[PDB]
C-alpha cells in the first residue's frame, strides 16, 4: 500500500557543535542527531523497480552539498553572471563526514538488497528504512573516493549501456588506496598520489574483464581523456581545502594491464566550479605536509562512440556531473509515500 513519490528529506549526522570543520559546522545547524538504533524491515515477497538515474534523492543531496560549499568554500575572486566579485578567502578546516538522508512522517525509504543489482530494474530483496547509510559528500572526478564497495562481484551502472553519451559507473568490490601528498619540501603546487601498481592493475583487469561481458566479448581499451577541462581530464578532488589535480594516464594507460605508481599532481588556485558558476581563484597552498589517503571505491568512465562494427571499445576516465557521485551511493534507495 505505497507509491513512488518525492518529498522534503532531512539529514542526520554525528557532527560536533564545537568544531570549526566546515562539514561539522553545516551539519550542526542543518541536520539532526543520528538514530541510536535504526530499524530495518524486510518486506516479504515484495518486488520493486529502481532507477538510480531518475532519483530525486540525488538532486536533494546535490542541493545540500552546493549549499555547504557555497557557505564554506568561498574563493578570493569569483566570476559568475558577468560580475567579478572580490572577497575574503581564509583557509578552512575541510574533511567530509558521513551524512544520513531520511524521510519525514508518512514516508519511507525502500532499500534494494540484491547483491547483484546494477541500479535500474526490479529488485527481489527489498527492505524498509528511515534513513540511508552514512554517505560522505566527497566531490571528485574520474575516481570515486571514500565510498561504499560492491559486496559481491564488480558492478557496471548505466542508464543506457549502448549510449556512448551516457556516463558509466564502476562499483569496485575491493578498495585501492590512493595516497596523495604535497610534501612540506619544486613548486608548492607540485604533489603526487602513490598507488600500489599490483593492487590497481589487478582491479583494472577485473574491470576490463567484466566490461567485456557487457559488450559481448569485444576488446576493451583504456585511454586518457580525449579532451575537455582539467577538472575532467584529470582526477580532481579537494584535500584539506586544497584543490588537487592529478594526471591519471599511468592509471589508464595499458602497460601492466608492478611497483609504486606515482601520479603527477597539481594544486591549482584557478578552478572551474563544479556548481557551474564559472571559474574562481583561491589562495596558495597551506604550509607543511598535505596528505590525503583515500579508498578508490568507484570509477567514472566514458566510452567512445566512434566504433560500430569494430572489434574494440575504448573507455576513458570521465565524470564532471557531481550528481553521478551521489548516484554511486544512492542507487539502492527510493522514496515512497505510504498509503
Ligand atoms: C554550467 C557548467 N559549466 C561547467 C564546466 N565544468 C566544471 O565546471 C567542473 C567539472 C568538475 C569540476 C571540479 C572542481 C573541483 C573539484 Cl575538487 C572537483 C571537481 N568543475 C564544463 C562546461 C562545458 C565545457 C567544459 N567545462 S559544469 C556546469 C554545470 O555545473
Ligand atoms: C536480503 O538482504 C539482506 C540484507 O542485505 C540479507 O541479510 C539477506 O540475506 C538477503 N536475502 C537473500 C535471499 O539474499
Ligand atoms: C579504506 O578501507 C579499509 C579497509 O580495506 C579501511 O580499514 C579504511 O578505514 C578505509 N579508509 C577510508 C574509508 O577512508
Ligand atoms: C570482485 O568481483 C570480481 C568479478 O568482477 C570477482 O572475480 C572477485 O572475486 C570479487 N572480489 C571479491 C573480494 O569478492
Ligand atoms: C541492469 O539490469 C536491468 C534488469 O536486469 C537491465 O534491463 C539493464 O539492461 C541492466 N543495465 C546494465 C547497464 O547492466
Ligand atoms: C540507448 O542508446 C542507443 C544508442 O543511441 C539508442 O539507440 C537507444 O534507443 C537508447 N535506449 C533508450 C531506451 O533510449
Ligand atoms: C603516503 O606516502 C607518504 C610519502 O610521501 C608516506 O610518508 C606515508 O606514510 C604514506 N601513507 C600511507 C597511509 O601509506
Ligand atoms: C598525462 O600525462 C601523459 C603522459 O605524461 C600525457 O600524455 C597526458 O596528456 C597527460 N594528461 C593531461 C590531462 O595533462
Ligand atoms: C603492494 O602490495 C603487496 C601485497 O599485495 C606488497 O607486498 C607490496 O609491498 C606493495 N607495494 C609496495 C610498493 O609497497
Ligand atoms: C577519505 O577519508 C580519510 C579519512 O577520514 C581522509 O583522510 C581523506 O582525506 C578522505 N579523502 C577525501 C578525498 O576526502
Amino acid at each position: 500500500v505505497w507509491k513512488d513519490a518525492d518529498t522534503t528529506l532531512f539529514c542526520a549526522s554525528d557532527a560536533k557543535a564545537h568544531e570549526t570543520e566546515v562539514h561539522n559546522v553545516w551539519a550542526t545547524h542543518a541536520c539532526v542527531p543520528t538514530d541510536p538504533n535504526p530499524q530495518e524491515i524486510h518486506l516479504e515477497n515484495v518486488t520493486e523497480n529502481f532507477n538510480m538515474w531518475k532519483n530525486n534523492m540525488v538532486e536533494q543531496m546535490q542541493e545540500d552539498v552546493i549549499s555547504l560549499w557555497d557557505q564554506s568554500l568561498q574563493p578570493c575572486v569569483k566570476l559568475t553572471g558577468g560580475s567579478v566579485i572580490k572577497q575574503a578567502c581564509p583557509k578552512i578546516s575541510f574533511d567530509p563526514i558521513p551524512i544520513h538522508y531520511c524521510t519525514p512522517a508518512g514516508y519511507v525509504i525502500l532499500k534494494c538488497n540484491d547483491k547483484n543489482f546494477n541500479g535500474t530494474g526490479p529488485c527481489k530483496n527489498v527492505s524498509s528504512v528511515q534513513c540511508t547509510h552514512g554517505i560522505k559528500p566527497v566531490v571528485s572526478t574520474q575516481l570515486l573516493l571514500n565510498g561504499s564497495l560492491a559486496e559481491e562481484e564488480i558492478i557496471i551502472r548505466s542508464e543506457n549501456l549502448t549510449n556512448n553519451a551516457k556516463t558509466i559507473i564502476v562499483h569496485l568490490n575491493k578498495s585501492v588506496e590512493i595516497n596523495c601528498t604535497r610534501p612540506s619540501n619544486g613548486d608548492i603546487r607540485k604533489a603526487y598520489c602513490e598507488i600500489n601498481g599490483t593492487k590497481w592493475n589487478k582491479v583494472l583487469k577485473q574491470v576490463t574483464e567484466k566490461l567485456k561481458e557487457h559488450f559481448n566479448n569485444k576488446t576493451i581499451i583504456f585511454q586518457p581523456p580525449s579532451g575537455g577541462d582539467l577538472e575532467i581530464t584529470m582526477h580532481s578532488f579537494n584535500c584539506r581545502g586544497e584543490f588537487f589535480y592529478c594526471n591519471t594516464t599511468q592509471l589508464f594507460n595499458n602497460t601492466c594491464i608492478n611497483g609504486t605508481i606515482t601520479l603527477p599532481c597539481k594544486i591549482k588556485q584557478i578552478i572551474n566550479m563544479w556548481q557551474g558558476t564559472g571559474q574562481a581563484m583561491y589562495a596558495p597552498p597551506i604550509d607543511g605536509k598535505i596528505n590525503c589517503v583515500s579508498n578508490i571505491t568507484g570509477i567514472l568512465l566514458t566510452r567512445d562512440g566512434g566504433a560500430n562494427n569494430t572489434s574494440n571499445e575504448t573507455f576513458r576516465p570521465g565524470g564532471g556531473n557531481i550528481k553521478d557521485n551521489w548516484r554511486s551511493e544512492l542507487y539502492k534507495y527510493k522514496v515512497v509515500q505510504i498509503e
Side-chain angles (χ1 to χ4, degrees):
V1 191
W2 60 81
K3 62 179 181 180
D4 303 331
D6 301 328
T7 184
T8 62
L9 303 176
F10 67 94
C11 56
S13 70
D14 298 327
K16 295 75 177 182
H18 58 65
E19 293 192 11
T20 61
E21 195 281 329
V22 293
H23 291 88
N24 282 269
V25 170
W26 178 88
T28 293
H29 65 67
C31 302
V32 296
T34 61
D35 196 316
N37 50 331
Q39 71 173 20
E40 179 179 354
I41 304 179
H42 292 278
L43 309 183
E44 303 181 10
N45 293 12
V46 175
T47 303
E48 290 283 333
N49 294 327
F50 288 76
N51 197 339
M52 59 175 298
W53 308 104
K54 297 178 60 180
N55 195 339
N56 184 261
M57 300 181 63
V58 174
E59 275 68 14
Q60 298 196 29
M61 182 173 182
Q62 176 75 347
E63 298 174 356
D64 281 339
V65 182
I66 292 181
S67 179
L68 186 158
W69 276 60
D70 287 21
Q71 300 177 9
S72 303
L73 288 167
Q74 205 66 12
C76 309
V77 181
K78 180 170 56 182
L79 305 174
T80 176
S83 59
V84 180
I85 301 180
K86 176 194 176 304
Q87 54 179 151
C89 52
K91 294 296 182 179
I92 66 176
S93 181
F94 188 93
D95 187 23
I97 63 177
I99 301 298
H100 300 263
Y101 282 89
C102 319
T103 52
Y107 296 84
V108 295
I109 303 179
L110 296 184
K111 182 180 181 180
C112 181
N113 294 322
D114 286 339
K115 317 182 76 65
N116 202 23
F117 182 70
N118 65 0
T120 62
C123 186
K124 298 182 178 301
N125 192 5
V126 183
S127 60
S128 179
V129 298
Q130 174 182 297
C131 308
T132 67
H133 62 284
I135 304 177
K136 291 186 177 182
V138 180
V139 178
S140 64
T141 61
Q142 294 190 3
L143 301 178
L144 296 176
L145 305 174
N146 283 2
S148 60
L149 293 174
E151 298 179 0
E152 295 185 356
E153 304 174 353
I154 301 181
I155 304 303
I156 302 298
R157 310 188 185 281
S158 179
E159 184 180 14
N160 184 12
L161 197 58
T162 305
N163 196 335
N164 59 86
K166 295 298 180 179
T167 62
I168 193 70
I169 298 182
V170 178
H171 200 182
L172 303 176
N173 58 5
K174 181 179 180 180
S175 299
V176 177
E177 277 195 356
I178 180 173
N179 176 16
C180 310
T181 298
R182 201 298 304 269
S184 183
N185 189 22
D187 297 331
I188 59 180
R189 304 178 184 87
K190 182 176 182 178
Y192 55 89
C193 298
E194 294 184 351
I195 303 80
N196 202 9
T198 303
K199 292 181 175 298
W200 171 255
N201 283 319
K202 178 179 183 178
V203 173
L204 191 59
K205 184 175 181 179
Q206 288 190 351
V207 177
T208 299
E209 286 295 312
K210 179 152 294 300
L211 287 181
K212 291 182 56 182
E213 295 180 342
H214 293 78
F215 290 96
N216 198 21
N217 294 13
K218 292 184 179 181
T219 301
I220 307 302
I221 303 180
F222 284 98
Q223 298 293 352
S226 60
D229 298 344
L230 294 181
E231 284 75 17
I232 59 181
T233 61
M234 304 179 66
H235 171 44
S236 64
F237 60 93
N238 192 279
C239 177
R240 316 308 178 187
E242 305 293 336
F243 294 91
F244 276 69
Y245 285 71
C246 304
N247 185 323
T248 61
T249 43
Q250 295 178 100
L251 298 182
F252 301 96
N253 196 24
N254 312 92
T255 56
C256 296
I257 303 78
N258 52 85
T260 295
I261 304 179
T262 303
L263 303 181
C265 295
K266 307 177 183 179
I267 296 185
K268 297 188 57 180
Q269 308 171 242
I270 305 178
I271 309 301
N272 277 27
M273 289 182 172
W274 60 268
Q275 296 86 323
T277 57
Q279 65 180 189
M281 180 168 56
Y282 294 83
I286 58 182
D287 295 331
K289 178 174 61 179
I290 310 176
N291 172 265
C292 284
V293 180
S294 307
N295 284 336
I296 303 176
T297 61
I299 302 181
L300 301 177
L301 300 178
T302 57
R303 180 183 61 89
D304 298 343
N308 296 14
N309 299 15
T310 71
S311 178
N312 301 335
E313 286 291 355
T314 306
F315 298 87
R316 311 177 188 267
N321 195 337
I322 307 304
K323 303 177 66 176
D324 293 333
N325 294 26
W326 318 143
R327 288 186 173 93
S328 64
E329 294 293 341
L330 301 173
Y331 64 93
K332 63 168 58 181
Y333 309 94
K334 78 167 188 177
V335 174
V336 298
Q337 182 182 5
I338 53 175
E339 179 179 355

